[PDB]
Each structure stands twice: as structure tokens, then as C-alpha cells.
Amino acid sequence: LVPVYIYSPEYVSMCDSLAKIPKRADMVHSLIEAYALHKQMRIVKPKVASMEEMATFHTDAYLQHLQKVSQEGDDDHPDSIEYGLGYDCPATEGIFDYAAAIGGATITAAQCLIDGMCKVAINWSGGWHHAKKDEASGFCYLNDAVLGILRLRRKFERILYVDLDLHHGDGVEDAFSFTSKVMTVSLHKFSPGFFPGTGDVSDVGLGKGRYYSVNVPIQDGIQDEKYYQICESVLKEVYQAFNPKAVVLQLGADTIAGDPMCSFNMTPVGIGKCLKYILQWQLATLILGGGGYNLANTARCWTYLTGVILGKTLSSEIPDHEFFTAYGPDYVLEITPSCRPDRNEPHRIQQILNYIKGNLKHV
Template sequence: PVYVYSPEYVALCDSLCKVPKRASMVHSLIEAYSLLDQMKIVKPKVASMEEMASFHTDAYLQHLQKVSEEGDDDHPESMEYGLGYDCPATEGIFEYAAAVGGATITAAQCLLDGKCKVAINWPGGWHHAKKDEASGFCYLNDAVLGILRLRQKFDRVLYIDLDLHHGDGVEDAFSFTSKVMTVSLHKFSPGFFPGKLNLGGTGDVTDVGLGKGRYYSVNVPIQDGIQDERYYQICETVLKEVYTVFNPDAVVLQLGADTIAGDPMCSFNMTPEGVGKCLKYVLQWQLATLVLGGGGYNLANTARCWTYLTGVILGRTLSSEIPDHE
């Protein structure tokens, strides 16, 4: 597998105020379990304006660049671009966004070039951003950029989102096409993000895509408290059907760790092993697979989860005795 990493990249990702230092916690735990030896480490390129504009509008990107240079969180136009409360316009946010977008594109390119079957970018997976709007801690939709890059070679791309939250930004981006199928398992209850109290939730089971893309969006709303066994049953049932019907050429997996018991979101009751079973199910298809992170606000648990999942990708079972590391 390819593991996208550079010290500069991790340092930039560490600066994200919603998950401070998470990227380096994840990386150092993966390193402590000596998993890096079994992966090809690829240094990420930074996304160009042109690459980001394959999805995002020029106006949004220029605004993001402007407020990022000035560290201006009170710009009058920022509200309409979704910047502020959940997505503060902090200084350097544009560099961070371009780095994450570039890392996911780099991972996708490795799959295009046949360098590997699986490419990993744990600091990626920011699935809420819209073409002209930041949302839910997401400034740039790297998952969409990765899918668009994969589409240069792979005709049908399947996006699977196992984060606690509905992958609305990715679904919206591809809601009119039959070439990208989006599948999201998520908590669904009135007012739970990205739903709004007055408008109900998003990602209801009736939300199936539009136009040519009708029935190419699959949503699996789930109630609080779900545990590994039931979650895996649902996941396997859905993915079995999806695989048969859609017959994908490549897969993008978003594995947000905010479903794990002990997350401040206090919603699902999963363990890394439960998510690992879902990951194994996808890996047995042996397709080009791009693996991304996402949510995960209990930072130590998130590091444990993604390290465990890295082990799953490598076919290694990790001991729960965490090795000494920084």
C-alpha cells in the first residue's frame, strides 16, 4: 500500500483547531507499531488552484485564500461562504486546505499509475464541503477531488462513507451522475449535523440522487447506540447489493472514527474491530481503493482506530499493548 506522508504535511494538519495535533498522534502510533516498513511512503504534492477548481468555484477559492492570508475571521462575505462558527477563517487555512486536497489527489494518482492497490491519506476525508461553501470543519472537499482524479482512469467509482455524519458534500457533488455511486451509513435524527432543525435531517433513506444519478445515492440512516455486530450486518447487506448492481472499478472509503465508543459525539458504540470488518469486506473485492479519515474527536481513540485499520490493510493483527512511542 501507499501511505501519503511528509513531516511538513502532518505539521500543517496538526494546526486544524478542531482536531489539534491529531495527525501526528495518528502517524506516531502507526510508526510505533512499525507499520511504515510495510508501506511505500509517498510525499504529497500541494493541490494547485486549477486542481481545486475541478470542484470548487473560483470565487470561493479566492475568498478562502484572501481570508487565510489576513487571518480575517470577520470578513463580511465570509458568512455566505460558510466561514465562521464551525469553519473559522484562521490564518493559513488555505495552505492547510491545499495540502489536504493535494494529499488525497496524490493518493488517487498512485492508484491511477498502478503503484498500489490501496492508498491511504488519514488526514483526508473532509466530506461536508460544498463547491462554494465550507461546512462542518471542512474547507475543501478532498474526497470529491480524489474521486474526480480517479475518474480519469476508472469509469465507475464507488464512494463509501462510514463516518458518523452523512457525507452530504460528496453526495451533492455527484447527485446527478450515474458514474459515481455514493453510499453513506450515518446517524440520522432531527437537527443532527448536517441536518438543520427546521429542515429535518439530510441523508434520509428516501434521498436517492437526481436526474441521471437517481438511485446512485444510497443512504442508510442509523439510530444511536449501534454496536459492531448489527452495524456490520447492515454494512455487508448494503455493500453486497451495491457491488452487484454498480460493479465499481475503484473505491473511495471514508472512515471517520467518530462512530467509536468514547467519542465526544456520544452516538454510536462501535469498536475499531467493527469498522475493520467493514474494511475487510471492501478489500476482498481487490479493487483500487483510496482510504481516507474524517471525523474522530477523541484523539487517542482515533489514533488507535486508524492504526488498527492500517494493520487490517496490511493483513496484520496488532496487539492491544501499545508500544512505547512519543
């Protein structure tokens, strides 16, 4: 069938404004373009999200406030702080239109999937997983992952959200905590002091959604093989227990060695195997990005992962293109782990995995 790639030049410029990750969207797309991977995909222009589409999760008070403060720069408005705007999520000029573009893009991806137009749709500029119904958080003005899941919910009865960002997918988890129609699984750094402070293995959801949230708390220094071992093992148990008919996959590259968060020690090859394992299920799959603050490494990563979606092996040499020099001084696609210790004790990992098996026996 071949994958949908959500993209337009206007979309990319829009996504380039975010101060936490400037030009990252351009770098990501330009590298994929340079390896000519767009030629093997169906390019789809994203619809901007309508108010009612956004309101499917976000309160009208939040959206209106976000739109109002969008007019010109800000950070000063009296009501901004209660809506999560301010110093993590500053309310700059245009943010609302930026938010509506990314939400729209993820919704367009989901709609493609419902319509049978692909088995895999990609929005590398999506994945803003902390935003709550009435609150910005963790650089997320809008939870486009939730919007995507609520779009998929039109066709699919069981949706699996898998979140391989460094941070807990707390916003998406909370959104679906009370329901059993969407199971969330997050692998993330969990250490008191580390944002957002949620997602211990004992967090399983609430009410009718009890045991339909899965959290895998992991410590600094994890490298490819042991990460995959954990991820494959949890996902095996999840697929057998939950039998999902669609998957939203968040792949924030802030786990990759060289990220200034300096926490995990992964390469794109190990994430790539987690991804291959998900894609072997051959379900409708909505792929999203997320964190990633070494810009060249994030483009390296997501370009690689696009390669795995297409079943391609990529030349190790980085092709000449507009951003070639950001890949200096070695100009290769491969990333090398740091010489840092892995702080994950096998006994704790095995404890976590057992707790999770135990929880999933209820599903």
C-alpha cells in the same frame, strides 16, 4: 504490491493546526510509526494541490476568497459568512494552504492508484466530506474526497464512494447527485436535529443520477455486529448492482465508543470488518479519515485499520512513543463499548434494507 501511505513531516505539521482536532495527525502517524507499520508501506510525499486542481470542483470565487482571508487571522470579513466561513469553519491564518495540502494529498493518493503503483493508498488526514463547491461546512474548507474521485475519474468509469463517518457524506453526495458514474453510499446517524440533517433512505439522487445515491439512516447505540450486518448487506447489493472499478472509502472515527459526540457505540474491529469486506473486492482503493474527536481513540482506530490493510495483528500493548501517556490509564489498543442502549429496532433496519434493495433494482 503493498499500500501507499501519504506522509511527510511537513504535511503532518500542517494538518496539526486545525483547532477541532489539534495534533491528531501527529498522534495518528506516531502510533502507526510505533507499531512499525510504515516499514511495510510505500511512503509518498504529497503534492500541494494547484488552483486548477482545486477548481476541478470548487468555484474560483470561493478559492480566491479562501486564499485572501488566509492572509492573517480573521472571522471578521464581511463576505466570509456566505462562503460558509465563521463559527463552524473559522477562517484562521493559513487555512488555504492547509486546505491545499489535504486536497493535494488525496489527489496524490488517487494518482498513485491510476498509475498501478498500489491497490490501496492512504491519507488519514483527508475525508472532509461536507464542503460544497462554493461553501465551507462541518469543519471542511475543501472537499478532498470529491477531488480524489474526480482524479480517479480519469481512468475509472464507475467509482463507489463509501462513507462510514458518523455524519452523512452530504457534500460528496450532492457533488455527484446528477451522475451515474459515481455511486455514493453513506451510513450515518440520521435524527432530526443532528448535523447535517440530510441523508434519509429516500434520498436517492436526482435526474440521471436517480438511484445512484444510497443512504442508510441509523440511530444511536449501534454496536459492531449489527453495524457490520447492515453494512455487508447494503454493500453486497451495491457491488452486484453497480459493479464498481474503484472505491474511495471514508472512515471517520467519530462512530467509536468514547467519542464526545456520544452517538454510535462502535469499536475498530467492527469497522475493520466493513473494511475487509471492501478490500476482498481487490479494487483500487483510496482510504481516508474524517471525524474523530477522542484523539487517542481515533489514532487507536486508524492504526488498527492500517493493520488490517496490511493483514497484521497488532500487539494489544501500546508501544512507548512521543504520545504514550495520552493512552492512559490502561495503555491498550482495544476499545470497550459503553453500557448504553442500542436504539435501532430490527424492523426499521429491515425496512431500510428493503427500500435500498428496491432502489438498486433500477441500477
